[PDB]
Amino acid sequence: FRGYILSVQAEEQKNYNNSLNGEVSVWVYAYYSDGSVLVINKNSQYKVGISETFKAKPRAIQIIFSPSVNVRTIKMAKYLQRSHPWEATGIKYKKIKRDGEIVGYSHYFELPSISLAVSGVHKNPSSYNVHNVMDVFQSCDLALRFCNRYWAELELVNHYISPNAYPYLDINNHSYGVA
Amino acid sequence: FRGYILSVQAEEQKNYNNSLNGEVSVWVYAYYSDGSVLVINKNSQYKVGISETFKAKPRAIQIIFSPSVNVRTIKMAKYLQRSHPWEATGIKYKKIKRDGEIVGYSHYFELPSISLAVSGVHKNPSSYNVHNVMDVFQSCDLALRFCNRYWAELELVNHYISPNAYPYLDINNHSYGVA
Amino acid sequence: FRGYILSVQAEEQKNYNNSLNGEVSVWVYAYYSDGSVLVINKNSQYKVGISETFKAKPRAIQIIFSPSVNVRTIKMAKYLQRSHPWEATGIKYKKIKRDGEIVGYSHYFELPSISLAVSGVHKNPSSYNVHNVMDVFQSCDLALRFCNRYWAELELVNHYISPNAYPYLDINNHSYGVA
Numbered sequence: 001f002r003g004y005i006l007s008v009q010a011e012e013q014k015n016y017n018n019s020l021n022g023e024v025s026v027w028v029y030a031y032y033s034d035g036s037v038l039v040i041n042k043n044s045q046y047k048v049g050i051s052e053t054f055k056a057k058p059r060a061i062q063i064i065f066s067p068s069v070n071v072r073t074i075k076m077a078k079y080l081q082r083s084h085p086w087e088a089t090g091i092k093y094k095k096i097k098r099d100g101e102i103v104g105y106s107h108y109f110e111l112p113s114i115s116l117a118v119s120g121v122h123k124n125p126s127s128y129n130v131h132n133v134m135d136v137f138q139s140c141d142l143a144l145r146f147c148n149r150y151w152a153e154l155e156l157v158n159h160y161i162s163p164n165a166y167p168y169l170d171i172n173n174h175s176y177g178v179a
Numbered sequence: 180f181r182g183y184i185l186s187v188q189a190e191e192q193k194n195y196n197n198s199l200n201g202e203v204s205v206w207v208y209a210y211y212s213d214g215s216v217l218v219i220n221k222n223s224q225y226k227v228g229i230s231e232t233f234k235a236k237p238r239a240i241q242i243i244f245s246p247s248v249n250v251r252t253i254k255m256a257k258y259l260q261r262s263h264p265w266e267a268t269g270i271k272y273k274k275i276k277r278d279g280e281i282v283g284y285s286h287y288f289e290l291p292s293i294s295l296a297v298s299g300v301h302k303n304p305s306s307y308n309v310h311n312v313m314d315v316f317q318s319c320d321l322a323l324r325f326c327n328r329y330w331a332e333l334e335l336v337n338h339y340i341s342p343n344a345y346p347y348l349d350i351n352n353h354s355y356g357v358a
Numbered sequence: 359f360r361g362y363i364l365s366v367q368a369e370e371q372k373n374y375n376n377s378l379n380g381e382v383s384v385w386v387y388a389y390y391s392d393g394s395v396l397v398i399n400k401n402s403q404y405k406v407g408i409s410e411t412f413k414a415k416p417r418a419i420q421i422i423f424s425p426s427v428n429v430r431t432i433k434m435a436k437y438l439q440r441s442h443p444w445e446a447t448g449i450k451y452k453k454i455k456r457d458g459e460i461v462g463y464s465h466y467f468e469l470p471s472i473s474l475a476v477s478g479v480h481k482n483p484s485s486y487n488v489h490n491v492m493d494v495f496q497s498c499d500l501a502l503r504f505c506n507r508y509w510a511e512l513e514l515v516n517h518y519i520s521p522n523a524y525p526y527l528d529i530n531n532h533s534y535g536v537a
Binding site: 192201204222245311316317318319320321322323325343344345 | 405409411434438439440441476488
Binding site for chain 3: 047050073076077080082083084085086117119121127128136140
């Protein structure tokens with residue numbers, strides 16, 4: 001029956017993504033004073049991060065991870081003689097839910113130009129058991145990065161979030177994603 | 180005799196390049212609809228990769244590795260919930276030969292803008308025996324990248340491929356390189 | 359007494375920076391033929407590097423590391439079949455001193471456009487004891503990079519070096535930094 005096969009094939013996808021061959025994804029949304037939105041997305045195996053400068057106008061930031069991330073591994077960096085190299089910010093991430101299922105994890109914060117870097121490791125319990133180290137080194141080379149700008153959030157939502165089934169939270173706290 | 184010394188000095192160079200202090204090199208050629216060619220070259224120790232977006236016009240791609248690469252380690256990446264993090268494409272690479280000697284390895288494919296990443300590890304049998312891991316981390320910092328554009332393939336061949344002794348295959352399937 | 363607490367708090371800062379949670383910093387200064395200066399700064403944990411091309415006019419280079427670097431780990435890269443992947447240049451670095459204390463390490467050299475990469479590892483004796491390898495991989499993602507251009511060295515010194523307490527050596531061999 002075409003109802004039963006569809007259901008098991010969803011359970012296979014979950015097991016694949018939660019294996020160490022599943023990707024970890026991160027998005028960084030920079031909300032600008034003219035109402036436009038810049039989004040940087042990176043996807044990779046084993047671990048993933050973004051490091052960028054948001055120059056001129058940016059007013060707030062939202063960082064979204066795929067559900068494969070281990071929230072406790074998330075780290076973020078933002079006088080040189082007296083500063084810590086990162087903060088562990090996982091406790092500030094909110095679950096994005098769709099039909100009861102976690103589709104992502106969101107950290108939104110307002111800015112008082114900023115340089116920002118964020119990093120997270122795949123959930124799999126084998127992650128801190130370094131598969132060979134050289135496989136992780138190759139994953140750093142194979143990571144794909146995407147960057148584009150949208151005129152307003154409505155346009156980002158209808159032509160970037162919705163058509164690609166990405167997880168998201170908009171200004172009205174409406175949540176997006178596919179369970 | 181100046182004939183004998185020249186020959187042994189070639190055997191020393193082979194042994195050096197096939198040691199773990201030899202570089203791995205990669206080139207990515209993007210062939211555009213106006214007949215121009217964009218080339219990105221990266222050279223590094225232990226392993227090497229490229230990750231770029233080719234935006235506007237690009238019609239085909241050729242990826243060339245130096246003979247120090249282990250062809251079986253080559254990996255290439257090109258809905259998020261349902262995609263594999265890379266394909267192992269080494270079996271698609273063709274040997275480039277000059278006077279009977281492998282001067283490079285070539286994967287050419289036509290496109291139906293693309294984002295693309297490719298990665299390969301040095302041939303040396305010690306590669307999967309991680310020298311210290313910190314030496315490999317430094318190699319990631321020391322990798323040098325070069326990018327330029329040429330008006331036509333003839334110009335790339337005469338002012339980039341030939342003067343630098345690089346391996347290549349042109350549109351007429353003529354092979355270049357120095358044995 | 360407010361004199362005693364200030365002194366011990368300096369000894370704590372030294373111990374922190376010389377721990378593996380202290381940052382390693384690197385600056386690359388490119389001196390151009392119009393008297394302007396381009397500076398690239400990167401800061402990170404465990405290790406740090408820069409890899410850039412300085413295109414059009416550049417006439418000399420100065421590379422400055424924070425005192426947390428292990429000078430013997432410094433490496434620099436600048437026909438493909440016959441070149442070494444880096445040189446260990448630590449012996450060319452000069453100590454920058456302020457009130458008897460090392461505030462940095464400087465390698466200045468004149469050029470005869472250049473592509474250049476430099477890499478150094480934190481001093482801590484535990485550095486070659488890979489904390490988990492995945493922590494070092496995350497440090498690569500969290501590294502922050504800064505780049506700007508100044509009209510003349512006097513402006514770089516008064517609006518970049520002095521206000522940020524960075525170590526430096528100017529054209530008159532005057533040294534800057536905070537002990």
